[PDB]
């Protein structure tokens, strides 16, 4: 049982081509969703900062975005992560606020029945 990496330049170009069709389908929105900033859970890397999965419910409510719409404007949700330190709430709320600063939202046509 042996594996060869001859398709390594083939697979990389397939991935790039897979990104370009995604960009074609969804033009204005970025090819990647926003991710939060979290700290690795170990004494070795705890002083580091990296990306998370999504923004917890305290990070959404504090920033001012409901949890239902957040999934629609590209902000992802992590029901499992929680905020134990306020610096973790702060680094990710401002991460949301800077995102909503640059976020153009296209209006959608809405059904308007004659009566009500």
């Amino acid at each position: 049982y042996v594996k060869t990496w001859f398709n390594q330049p083939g697979r990389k170009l397939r991935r790039r081509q897979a990104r370009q069709t995604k960009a074609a389908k969804i033009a204005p929105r970025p090819v990647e969703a926003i991710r939060p900033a979290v700290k690795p859970p170990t004494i070795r890397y705890n002083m580091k900062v990296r990306a998370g999965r999504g923004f917890t419910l305290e990070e959404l409510k504090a920033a001012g975005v409901s949890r239902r719409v957040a999934s629609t404007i590209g902000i992802p949700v992590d029901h499992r992560r929680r905020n134990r330190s306020e610096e973790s709430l702060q680094r990710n709320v401002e991460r949301i606020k800077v995102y909503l600063a640059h976020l153009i939202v296209f209006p959608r046509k809405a059904g308007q029945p004659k009566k009500g």
Partner: protein
Amino acid sequence: APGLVVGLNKGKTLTKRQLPERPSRRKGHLSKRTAFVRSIVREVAGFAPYERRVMELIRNSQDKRARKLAKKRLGTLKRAKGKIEELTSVIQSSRLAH
């Protein structure tokens, strides 16, 4: 400019927040309705054959063997302790009612 800046650190200043309660942690609370439902079915289904013999031992007052029998049948003391307390609750209630 939305941009993630990883590496080095972001901050050493810490402030713990008293975390709320998650509702999945709430599992295992005794609902007021279901306690009644469990009790009524316990009355209806009767008692297990081995568990019936435990009642007689308590009535005959060989509680030491009652623990031994339940422990043998169930598997651990805390499982046997709860059953004995479950059984003796039946016995006292039947004796006051009848």
